[PDB]
From a paper:
Precise division over and capture of the forespore-destined chromosome requires [name], a TetR family DNA-binding protein conserved across the genus Bacillus. [name] binds to five nearly palindromic DNA motifs (RBMs), two on each chromosomal arm and one near oriC. Second, artificially induced expression of [name] during vegetative growth disrupts Z ring assembly and inhibits cell division. We propose that RBM-bound [name] complexes function as a developmentally regulated nucleoid occlusion system for fine-tuning the position of the septum relative to the chromosome during sporulation.
[name]-His6 was purified and crystallized, and the structure was solved using single-wavelength anomalous dispersion (SAD) phasing at a resolution of 2.6 Å. [name] crystallized as a homodimer with one molecule in the asymmetric unit of a P41212 crystal lattice. Each [name] subunit is composed of 10 α-helices connected by loops and turns. Similar to other structurally characterized TetR family proteins, α1, α2, and α3 comprise the DNA-binding helix-turn-helix (HTH) domain and α4 to α10 comprise the regulatory domain. There are two major regions for dimerization contacts. Helices α7, α8, α9, and α10 form regulatory domain contacts with α7′, α8′, α9′, and α10′; α8, α10, α8′, and α10′ form a four-helix dimerization motif. A second interface is formed by α6 and α6′ at the junction between the regulatory and DNA-binding domains. Although the crystallization conditions included RBM-containing DNA, we observed no DNA in the crystal structure. In fact, the HTH DNA-binding domain is involved in extensive crystal-packing interactions, likely precluding DNA binding within the crystal lattice. In the [name] structure (unbound from DNA), there is no obvious ligand binding pocket in the α5-to-α7 regulatory region; therefore, its affinity with DNA is unlikely to be regulated in this manner.
Residue numbers in the entry:
A (entry chain A), B (entry chain A): 1 to 200
């Protein structure tokens, strides 16, 4: 029904952290845009850094939920249709949090013990799930034509492009540079790519 | 010999725009770090936005110089060793301006008529040079196994990774996440990639 004061603060911090930078916005502007007293921010978050760490911690835990539920489907089906489901889920998760996603990938500062540690956690988990998926892929004659870290780097870099230089994506779907990003359309393009690096 | 006052200002703006954001730093902090009066900044650059546009205009014109001198070698040799030279030049240019490069690719704001127009220029030039290189590539039985916008998107996204999530690059060279970025090492990895999307 009604949005909690803590949620109002978060919603507002995402929107301004994404517009100006982290160092660009202040607790005061965040409060005024959330129509709450400044005291609420310090009470729930300690301050700007702590508000950032909450936003970054939230993003990566939502991201690794998609990873974990791909681990919980290693049975269901073939490992390439497995992988396509996980790519689809990330493209969708990225878009559903697009303001948060853009900020997390671009924010110029970041680095903050806690954040260096949130990131390390997600990367070890991401690495591990992709071996599992690729391992049971070899309990069937579906094999990567790439080492695993090579595959992950090209995947991760393609997944980030919508939030950095989307125009190149517009160009491959339209030979035009300024069409809006539709992630379901992009998925088709990544799928073709994924298919081209499996051999039977 | 001695660094010009205008250069002192630029050097300082690059270093702080890269540390905090654009909206994070002020003309006052830029002046103090350059040991020049604030008046010099307004005189040469109008202000923070105008200083940014100078830094972004400089980055892309240095980038398209590497593109233009690859156009001026369509004669010299084979189009894949052509392409490898251009990739090498960009990796090197990116690193030689690494503080500038990181800021240009990550800065959360940007967009400013002028900048929307600097970007459009470079992208049309980049697109055009890559057709030339790939066209004379077909006056010899060296062909892309990818459409041209697909090739450019994957190349451009691999070229940007050192300034966004370098750890994935460390992992492919070392199976370790925190080694320093050596662009000459990365070039070898992109070269293998480039080779895998040409057919004879």
């Amino acid at each position: 029904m009604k949005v909690s004061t803590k949620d109002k603060i978060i919603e507002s911090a995402v929107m301004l952290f994404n517009q100006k930078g982290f160092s660009g916005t202040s607790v005061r502007e965040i409060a005024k845009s959330a129509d709450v007293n400044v005291a609420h921010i310090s009470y729930y978050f300690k301050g700007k850094g702590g508000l950032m760490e909450h936003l970054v911690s939230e993003f990566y835990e939502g991201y690794s939920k998609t990873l974990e539920t791909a681990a919980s489907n290693i049975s269901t089906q073939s490992t390439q249709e497995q992988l396509l489901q996980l790519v689809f889920d990330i493209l969708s998760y990225q878009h559903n949090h697009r303001q948060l996603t853009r900020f997390v990938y671009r924010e110029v500062t970041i680095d903050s013990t806690l954040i260096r540690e949130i990131m390390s956690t997600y990367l070890m988990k991401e690495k591990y799930i992709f071996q599992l998926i690729i391992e049971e892929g070899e309990k069937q004659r579906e094999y990567l034509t790439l080492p695993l870290p090579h595959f992950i780097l090209q995947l991760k870099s393609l997944l980030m492009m919508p939030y950095l230089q989307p125009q190149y994506i517009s160009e491959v779907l339209y030979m035009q540079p300024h069409e809006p990003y539709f992630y379901k359309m992009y998925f088709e393009e990544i799928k073709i790519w994924i298919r081209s690096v499996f051999r039977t």
